[PDB]
Amino acid sequence: FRLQCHRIVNDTIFTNLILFFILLSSISLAAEDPVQHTSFRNHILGNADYVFTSIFTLEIILKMTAYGAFLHKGSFCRNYFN
């Protein structure tokens, strides 16, 4: 029943997580269009960015709980999850 942690650490999860983080940082931030009205193309771009951010948050939270209830105390830098 503990093979889930092994699957989380294995299966190149780190590489795809890095790729997803880089792509979300590049898309949801650089392509922001600060000074604009609601618009149509900008509106649908913002909606797509919101949906992508939501699904990325969902994937991050579902990829959590690797060690279980032990990373809360021994967290040198895992506290970023907060």
Side-chain angles (χ1 to χ4, degrees), residues 1-63 65-82:
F1 69 101
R2 282 276 72 95
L3 196 59
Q4 182 65 214
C5 180
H6 172 54
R7 299 303 177 90
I8 289 178
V9 299
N10 205 74
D11 301 0
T12 69
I13 294 300
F14 163 77
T15 59
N16 50 77
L17 280 182
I18 279 293
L19 216 171
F20 295 157
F21 296 160
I22 293 301
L23 72 87
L24 62 83
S25 60
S26 62
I27 295 299
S28 181
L29 286 314
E32 193 72 13
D33 295 70
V35 45
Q36 258 104 345
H37 59 121
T38 62
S39 301
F40 178 81
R41 307 250 64 177
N42 301 331
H43 190 257
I44 62 181
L45 283 177
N47 296 330
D49 295 357
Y50 149 78
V51 172
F52 292 156
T53 306
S54 62
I55 65 179
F56 292 154
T57 53
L58 292 181
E59 78 184 15
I60 295 173
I61 64 180
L62 70 85
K63 277 188 172 59
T65 68
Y67 271 91
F70 268 93
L71 83 169
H72 63 284
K73 45 169 60 65
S75 177
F76 282 87
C77 298
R78 272 298 179 181
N79 43 21
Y80 85 108
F81 202 95
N82 197 335

